[PDB]
Design goal:
The structure is cut from a larger assembly and holds nine protein chains of nine kinds.
Chain A (H helix, E strand, L loop, with lengths): L23 E5 L6 E5 L30 E4 L3
Antiparallel strand pairs in A: 1-2, 1-3
Chain C lengths: L18 E3 L6 E3 L4 E3 L2 E3 L3 H10 L9 E3 L2 E3 L1 H6 L16
Antiparallel strand pairs in C: 1-2, 3-6, 4-5
Chain E lengths: L4 E6 L8 E7 L9 H4 L3 E5 L1 H4 L7 E6 L3 E2 L2 E2 L2 E7 L1 H7 L6 E9 L5 E9 L15 H21 L2 H8 L3 H10 L10 E8 L5 H8 L1
Parallel strand pairs in E: 1-6
Antiparallel strand pairs in E: 1-2, 3-4, 4-7, 5-6, 7-10, 8-9, 9-10
Helix pairs in contact in E: 4-6
Classes of the chains: A mainly beta (76), B alpha+beta (98), C alpha+beta (95), D mainly alpha (37), E alpha+beta (210), F alpha+beta (85), G alpha/beta (127), H mainly alpha (149), I mainly beta (148).
The structure holds one RNA strand of 241 nucleotides.
PDB class: ribosome
Keywords: ribosome
Entry title: Cryo-electron microscopy reconstruction of the Plasmodium falciparum 80S ribosome bound to E-tRNA
RNA sequence: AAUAGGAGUAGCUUGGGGACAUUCGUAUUCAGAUGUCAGAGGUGAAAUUCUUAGAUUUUCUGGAGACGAACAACUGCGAAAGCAUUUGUCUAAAAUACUUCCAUUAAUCAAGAACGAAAGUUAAGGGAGUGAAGACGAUCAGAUACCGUCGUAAUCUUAACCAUAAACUAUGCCGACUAGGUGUUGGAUGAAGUGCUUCCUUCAGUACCUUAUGAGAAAUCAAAGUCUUUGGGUUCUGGGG
């Protein structure tokens, strides 16, 4: 009955209603501790602000961050 | 790839710098110190290349060898006549100078 | 007609393939169609092997095996009874 | 006839040979025209 | 016929048995002094039949005839080959062969060529019958294998390099390096050929021999 | 307007001689008078002045070359082989 | 004490060659074919012919004085066939029976890495 | 797909919420300035939007600002004479031709040259129908490097 | 006027007297006016240099072989020819080369040759269309024609 | 901002896609050695053939062209023809992922064009093996054939042509909708074996099995279905022998 099926979330991008599986993330760097806006699925290198040390390594999936760091979802 | 990167930078310079190409302009630019960077095609007659290199070295600016040939450096600078040597005398907002 | 769904050969997603040549008559045959038998064969019989072991040094001697792999064309394969005729319904049977 | 030549259900002589025989005949006619004209 | 004469075949110091047979050689008459006919021929010795150890039975060594005194031939190292049955046995479909090779030179200035084979391993969570690696991966594995072998070969004197071949060190090293990128299985050196041996010194050859 | 359907450069020979012979000449002559690019300057001015001798008009400089071209393929392969070492 | 020679056995679907030699290859001991021992102008492939040939070479080799043999088998070749011919088994059996000591046995059949084009047409031998 | 085979459903698609999301507090003026700077320093518009999204943290400039990025670039006057997509296609054509000029035997590269050349003509025809290209512009095999300079 | 290959005017500076002396070398293809030409045992393998055959790497293409040493070049001089070096003996001293006819020959190592193919390649590709061209060809050679 | 389209960006994405350079292996063959001694090749049976001036066979050096097995599949890539050794360089490609850009740019297409197996042609090299022609020996009442031995042209590279092939999924191409299960090659998402590995979910390739109160003249077909309940768009083609 495809009007309002709740557990359809698992289907491919292009469902009953479009919805991105991509979001923005509030991230901070271990030992430097400044807030940064960042994109889950970022496509080019991502630096920490005070001294440019890499944060996230881009690669063609969801992107792999670094071993460190802590991440809130930045959805309102 | 490295050459292509130079060519892209050069394309920016061509669009928004101040530049001049040809022997006499090159000599005046270096002599003045107006020049910031000299870009020389491989083909160039040896004696002229040598003089430009010496002048540039003397007036303390870089000389950079262009990967291809005289026509190609001209088409890279958007012109339909071969070029041999050009002097950037003011960079555009480009990453060229480093 | 159109007896064989895949024409007795494994061609899909491929325009062309190499011929290999039939070992028992030399004819050309496409590798996707050819009847391949990885015949593992011993250099001699058992009673021969027994006599060789008896004769041999070492006493832990072991006879060497033969590694061949023979490719047959359709005519040869059916003639020397590698592949039986079978029956119309059972033509998709294998293993 | 039409494009699908061959098909030997009828038992007619080999299509390729018929083609070879006819190609030879055509050559000979073409040669004769060359002498005449 | 009647004019032949036996000569004993000795092998260098590292091998255990060091008497791998007797060879007959034709007539002693001038101007062809028999020694010349004896010199330069080549011997395929099974490696097991040289140590007395059947775990090396799928390897054979080439030993070349290079120096003679009277009744004795002492020989030099000439190459290393795998027995064709063993090579076939390793090959079974659903696994994928990887073959490297390269040219390399010794500290002694022998130029050699090495042919190195390597097979994939299934490992336990895989299930699925086929185990083939990505082509990009096999290319990386092949380069890595070539790199290890040329580095290992280049280092030492020839006698030690040959000695290294005997308990098969090279394969173990190749497997350990490649494990991170892909699991491997029975990794051997299929063939070794000497390409350009340096000019002979009887002194050095015998001193190595004793 | 378009003078010949085929012949071009070899039209000077006229109705004389074999067509096949003329065709072979046509290929070599098209190659022969072709202006090569001069790798001593970047102009397309290199011409043949005599059997093996190729002058650039702009550079006033003589390149030694083939019979019918600035570069024969044999020489090009040899040159590359040397370069590689 | 013991001494080894190398017994090259070539079986083709005609002849079964027994050619035993010195350990270096170079320098023969006895070449004796299979065709030698039978006047039939067939049956150079035969087990029987091969058996006769084997016993005589074994007898001669014992007279000569090398006691024992390594066997190097060879089937025809990549340009014709990879199958060891019929009499090869017979020759091996006869040699073991004879009383010589039977050392390492190896296949050195000449295989082609490639596939250089073999004789008979694309449509192969039609016999 | 336009040429070859295969549908290829790779795509990327905006959420249902089409307003500015509350978390981003940057105002239009700052973002306008930033976009202009990136272009001026030499970057191509598709890259500028992507670069802006990741580095500066703005998804969907059309929600955070009143106007699409090509339009604002044009409004501030800085936008390229040849449209971006056409320009890159011409670049691809020039490179391909350079290879073919050196090497005359590559059948696939020549097949691709015909295919790409046709694609340029189709896109060019659309740009002529708009007023984003000069009417007497044409593209030629000869001119191609020089053309896009 | 004799041969298809052009001749190359080469200047050296004398080794026991002041000033410049001119020789005539036969030109390799791809060489040019204002090129520096080097001759000798230590000369680098590069086109149009003159080197002893003993110092070639194998499979190089050469011309101007001296059939025996010091003879100033006597094999491989006609247009578009070359020889190939095919081998160096283990004790050195001799070298093995291939003349363009199809024979293999063995020469002394210290014999000269010139790196690169002889100039004016492909000369007999072009057909001689008319009799007068043949007349002009023989006119600068030798009276030997028309044949009869 | 079209599960339309194009363009972009990203990943130690992918692959026997293309091109050029490059490199190695093996047999076969030639030449040079080497030891042997009578037959060896050849077959349904045999002969023609080759062999005491040492064949066949043994092993080694050097040369040469050819091919690149095994691994290798109801596998991969290519518009299709087609494409399988090594590394490099130059190239293209598709999928995926993408809160990146453009905003209908499209679909199929008479005209015209690009590529287009194999043979054949023209020209230079090149020439191992194979081998239309041809020559013999056989087989047969006969054999211009099947079989055998030898053997030009062609086969290979370069440079032109030729424009056809049962050039075959004998299934035009684009678009929506239908029904399961078994797999498999390529990505991406989650969870569970020792960062990595696996499995789950899901795309795009791609086959198979079962099922068609679907279809078909049946064979059979997940398209040949959604059709006298006949019309989603379009190019081409056929009309008894």
């Amino acid at each position: 009955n495809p009007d309002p099926v709740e557990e359809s979330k698992k289907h491919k991008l292009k469902r009953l209603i479009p919805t991105p599986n991509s979001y923005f993330m509030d991230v901070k760097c271990p030992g430097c501790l400044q807030i940064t806006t960042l994109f889950s699925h970022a496509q080019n290198v991502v630096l920490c602000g005070s001294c440019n040390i890499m944060l996230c390594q881009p690669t063609g999936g969801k992107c792999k961050l670094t071993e460190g760091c802590s991440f809130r979802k930045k959805i309102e | 790839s490295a050459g292509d990167n130079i060519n892209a930078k050069l394309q920016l310079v061509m669009k928004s710098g101040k530049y001049q190409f040809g022997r006499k302009s090159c000599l005046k630019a270096l002599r003045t110190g107006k020049g910031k960077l000299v870009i020389v095609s491989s083909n160039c007659p040896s004696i002229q290349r040598s003089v430009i290199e010496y002048y540039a070295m003397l007036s303390k600016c870089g000389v950079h060898d262009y990967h291809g040939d005289n026509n190609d450096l001209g088409t890279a600078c958007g012109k339909l006549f071969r070029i041999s040597c050009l002097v950037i005398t003011d960079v555009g907002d480009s990453d060229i100078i480093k | 007609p159109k007896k064989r769904r895949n024409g007795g050969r494994s061609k899909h997603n491929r325009g062309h393939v190499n011929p290999l040549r039939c070992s028992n008559c030399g004819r050309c045959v496409p590798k996707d169609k050819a009847i391949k038998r990885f015949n593992i064969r011993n250099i001699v019989d058992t009673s021969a092997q027994r006599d060789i072991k008896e004769a041999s040094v070492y006493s832990t001697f072991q006879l060497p095996k033969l590694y061949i792999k023979q490719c047959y064309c359709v005519s040869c394969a059916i003639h020397s009874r590698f592949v039986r005729v079978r029956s119309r319904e059972q033509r998709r049977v294998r293993k | 006839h039409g494009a699908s030549r061959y098909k030997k259900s009828r038992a007619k002589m080999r299509w390729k040979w018929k083609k070879k025989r006819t190609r030879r005949l055509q050559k000979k006619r073409r040669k004769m025209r060359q002498r005449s004209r | 016929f009647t004019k032949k004469e036996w000569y004993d075949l000795k092998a260098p110091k590292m091998f255990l048995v060091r008497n791998f047979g007797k060879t007959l050689v034709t007539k002693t008459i001038g101007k062809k002094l028999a020694t010349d006919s004896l010199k330069g021929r080549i011997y395929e010795v099974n490696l097991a039949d040289l140590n007395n150890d059947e775990d090396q039975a799928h390897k054979k060594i080439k030993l070349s005839c290079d120096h003679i005194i009277n009744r004795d031939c002492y020989t030099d190292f000439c190459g290393l080959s795998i027995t064709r049955d063993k090579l076939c046995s390793l090959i079974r479909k659903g696994y994928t062969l990887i073959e490297g090779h390269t040219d390399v030179k010794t500290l002694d200035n022998y130029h050699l060529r090495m042919f190195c084979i390597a097979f994939t391993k299934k490992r336990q969570n895989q299930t699925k019958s086929t185990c083939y690696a990505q082509t990009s991966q096999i290319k990386k594995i092949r380069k890595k294998m070539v790199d290890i072998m040329t580095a290992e070969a280049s280092k030492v004197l020839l006698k030690d390099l040959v000695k290294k071949f005997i308990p098969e060190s090279i394969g173990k090293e190749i497997e350990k390096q490649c494990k991170k990128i892909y699991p491997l299985q029975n990794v051997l050196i299929r063939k070794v050929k000497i390409l350009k041996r340096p000019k002979l010194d009887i002194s050095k050859l015998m001193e190595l021999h004793t | 307007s378009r003078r010949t359907k085929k012949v071009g450069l070899t039209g000077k020979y006229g109705t004389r001689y074999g067509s096949s012979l003329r065709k072979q000449i046509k290929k070599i002559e098209l190659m022969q008078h072709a202006k090569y690019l001069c790798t001593f300057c970047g102009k397309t001015a290199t011409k043949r002045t005599c059997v093996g001798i190729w002058k650039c008009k702009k550079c006033k400089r003589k390149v030694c070359g083939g019979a019918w071209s600035l570069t024969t393929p044999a020489a090009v392969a040899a040159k590359s082989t040397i370069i590689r070492l | 004490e013991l001494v080894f020679g190398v017994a090259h056995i070539f079986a083709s679907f005609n002849d079964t060659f027994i050619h035993v030699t010195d350990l270096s290859g170079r320098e023969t001991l006895v070449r004796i074919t299979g065709g030698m021992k039978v006047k039939a102008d067939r049956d150079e492939s035969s087990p029987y012919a091969a058996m006769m040939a084997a016993q005589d070479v074994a007898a001669r080799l014992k007279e000569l004085g090398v006691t024992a043999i390594h066997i190097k088998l060879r089937a025809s070749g990549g340009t014709k066939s990879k199958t060891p011919g019929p009499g090869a088994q017979s020759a091996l059996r006869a040699l073991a029976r004879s009383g010589l000591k039977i050392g390492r046995i190896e296949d050195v059949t000449p295989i082609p890495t490639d596939s250089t084009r073999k004789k008979s047409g694309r449509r192969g031998r039609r016999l | 797909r336009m040429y070859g085979k295969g549908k290829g459903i790779s795509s990327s698609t905006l959420p249902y919420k089409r307003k500015q999301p509350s978390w981003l507090k940057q105002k239009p003026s700052e973002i306008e300035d930033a976009i202009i700077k990136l272009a001026k320093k030499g970057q191509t518009p598709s890259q500028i939007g992507a670069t802006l999204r990741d580095n500066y943290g703005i998804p969907q400039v059309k929600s955070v600002t009143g106007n699409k990025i090509l339009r604002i670039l044009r409004a501030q006057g800085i936008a390229t004479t040849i449209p971006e997509d056409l320009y890159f296609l011409i670049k691809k054509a020039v490179s391909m031709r350079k290879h073919l000029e050196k090497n005359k035997k590559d059948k696939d590269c020549k097949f691709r040259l015909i295919l790409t050349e046709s694609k340029i003509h189709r896109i060019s025809r659309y740009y002529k129908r708009k007023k984003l290209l000069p009417s007497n512009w044409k593209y030629q095999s000869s001119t191609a490097s020089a053309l896009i300079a | 006027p004799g041969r298809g290959a052009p001749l190359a005017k080469v200047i050296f500076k004398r080794t026991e007297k002041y000033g410049k002396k001119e020789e005539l070398i036969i030109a390799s293809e791809g060489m040019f006016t204002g090129q520096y030409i080097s001759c000798g045992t230590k000369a680098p393998l590069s086109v149009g240099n003159i080197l002893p055959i003993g110092k070639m790497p194998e499979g190089t293409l050469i011309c101007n072989l001296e059939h025996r040493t010091g003879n100033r070049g006597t094999l491989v001089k006609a247009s578009g020819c070359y020889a190939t070096v095919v081998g160096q003996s283990e004790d050195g001293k001799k070298t093995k080369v291939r003349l363009p006819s199809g024979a293999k020959k063995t020469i002394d190592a210290k014999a000269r040759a010139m790196v690169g193919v002889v100039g004016a390649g492909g000369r007999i590709d072009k057909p001689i269309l008319k009799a007068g061209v043949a007349h002009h060809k023989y006119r600068v050679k030798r009276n030997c024609w028309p044949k009869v």
